[PDB]
Structure 1
């Protein structure tokens, strides 16, 4: 999660409120987010494949992107390579 004092850390389940530990997957960094799809009562369509779909991770509460400074960091801007 993200904490104001230490930054990107790992915390116990007791302190992990929803705001700090909410993360999302995205395929494009510059693209603006649209309205989220309603939750379906079923499996739904598949989108992300193992070992083939490069992805980015974003903290939904701040919009920052993860990268390397090899310690990992969160940055307002991206970097040359941030796919996983």
Structure 2
């Protein structure tokens, strides 16, 4: 989730990580990961 908590009650608001380049004050999918 900052350390690990159980997956028995791991919910959406607790464990949801994401990946971004550097975000400013703002068939298969698109090929963006390298």
Greater RCO, 1 or 2 (C-alpha within 8 Å, sep 6+): 2
TM-score (norm 2): 0.63
Structure with the higher fraction of residues in strand conformation: 1
Mark the runs of 5 or more structure 1 residues left unpaired by the alignment: 1-6, 33-41, 49-84
TM-score (norm 1): 0.33
Residues 8-59 of structure 1: per-residue CA shift (max 9 Å, x gap): 1101111201101011110014352xxxxxxxxx3112111xxxxxxxxxxx
Shift >3 Å, 4+ stretches: none
- How large is the Cα RMSD of the aligned pairs? 2.1
